[PDB]
Structures are given as C-alpha cells and as structure tokens.
Design a protein around this ligand. Structure first.
Ligand SMILES: NC(=O)C1=CN([C@@H]2O[C@H](COP(=O)(O)OP(=O)(O)OC[C@H]3O[C@@H](n4cnc5c(N)ncnc54)[C@H](OP(=O)(O)O)[C@@H]3O)[C@@H](O)[C@H]2O)C=CC1
Length: 184
C-alpha cells in the first residue's frame, strides 16, 4: 500500500521555522515509529520517502531511520546522502522504483513522511491513498500547512487495525490518531 503519515495542528499547521510547531509528543513519536516500521508481510520491510530537508533534520546518529528502507527526494543531489538507501529525483521515479520486481518482493508498505513539499505532491497522487493523520487538538503558530483533506474523496475510517482512536493527552495537549482513505 501507499500511505502518508503526518501530525497537524487545529489550524492545519505542520511546521514553523523548519521545525514542528508544538513541543515533542512521546506517544506521537512512538506511533509514527511503529506504523512506519511494521510490515504486514513476514520477510518484507517498509519503505519511507522523505524530502531532503526532512532527511537532514533527523539527528545523524539516528540516520537512516532504523528498520525501514529510507529514500530521499532531491532534484540537486547526485548520489544518495551518506546513510540513505536511495535517492530519487521525483516522486514519480520513487514510486516507479517500488514497482520494480526487486523492490516489490522486498517492500510491503510505502510511507510518505514529509516534509511540506512532499506532502503537497503526495496529496496530488491519483489512486489508492491512506492518510494517517495525528490531529493535535490545539492551535500552534505555523508558517507551513498541510494540504486540504477533501472529504468528497477521503473517507474517515471509523476504526483501523493497530490504531487507538480515543483522544489522548500529554502535558495538557490533546491529540488523536485518524485514518482516511481514498480510492479514485
Ligand atoms: N508535521 C509533520 O508531521 C511534519 C512536518 N514537517 C515540516 O515540514 C517542513 C519542511 O518541509 P520542506 O521545506 O518542504 O522540506 P522537505 O523535507 O519536503 O524537503 C524539501 C526538499 O526536498 C526535495 N524535494 C521535495 N519534493 C521533491 C520532489 N517531488 N522531487 C524532488 N525533490 C523533492 C528538494 O530538495 P533539493 O533542494 O535538493 O532539490 C526540496 O528542496 C518543516 O517545518 C518540518 O517541521 C516535516 C515532516 C513531518
């Protein structure tokens, strides 16, 4: 499957000055880690696709993201940055790679993990897309925003395996995990 995962504030914010608009949420991180890492097929791995700025925002000691195949998008880089598994020059190319026999027999889920520019392009993807949205239920000052989630085509799933849907809360900040699907 092809999947996008993001955390968004109530004002649809996703970034401020190259960082997250809110303080670190422990269970949001844990959820992200588990969902992107966990394959539904024994013997396969998941693949994460991210923009260049998001790659370099990961502390070097934690690159590549453990247990996942890490693919970075960049129009300018000539070889993969140290530690990355693949470098693609477009989202089209990255998705085409995942369809090659030697990735298809290796990869289960493909996850788009940001940043803003990649989400924008991923939100224009035709076909089957699932959006795993962590709703942070507060406004935060933001300078970059997640694209509109068009409810004409995305349906909020009432339940999803492995996803706690109840409202959560850390140091007074409420949040909840949602899953949307489109098939167009
Ligand atoms: N709330 C959340 O869940 C998340 C939020 N974010 C936020 O996003 C913001 C950063 O977003 P942004 O600046 O867009 O950074 P990105 O991580 O999307 O990196 C942008 C760079 O990636 C490359 N790139 C992106 N899309 C493509 C494409 N389709 N084809 C080829 N190259 C591509 C380009 O590299 P080049 O210049 O080399 O061509 C571009 O300059 C930050 O505020 C950050 O906190 C990030 C992740 C998760």
């Amino acid at each position: 499957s092809l999947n996008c995962i993001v955390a968004v504030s109530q004002n649809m914010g996703i970034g401020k000055n190259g960082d997250l608009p809110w303080p670190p949420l422990r269970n949001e991180f844990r959820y992200f880690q588990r969902m992107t890492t966990t394959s539904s097929v024994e013997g396969k791995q998941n693949l994460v696709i991210m923009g260049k700025k998001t790659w370099f925002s990961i502390p070097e000691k934690n690159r590549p993201l453990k247990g996942r195949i890490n693919l970075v998008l960049s129009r300018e880089l000539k070889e993969p940055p140290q530690g990355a598994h693949f470098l693609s020059r477009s989202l089209d190319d990255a998705l085409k790679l995942t369809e090659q026999p030697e990735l298809a027999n290796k990869v289960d889920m493909v996850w788009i993990v940001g940043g803003s520019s990649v989400y924008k392009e991923a939100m224009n993807h035709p076909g089957h897309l699932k959006l795993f949205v962590t709703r942070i239920m507060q406004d935060f000052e933001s300078d970059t925003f997640f694209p509109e989630i068009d409810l004409e085509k995305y349906k909020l799933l009432p339940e999803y395996p492995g996803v706690l849907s109840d409202v959560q809360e850390e140091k007074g900040i409420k949040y909840k995990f949602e899953v949307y699907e489109k098939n167009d």
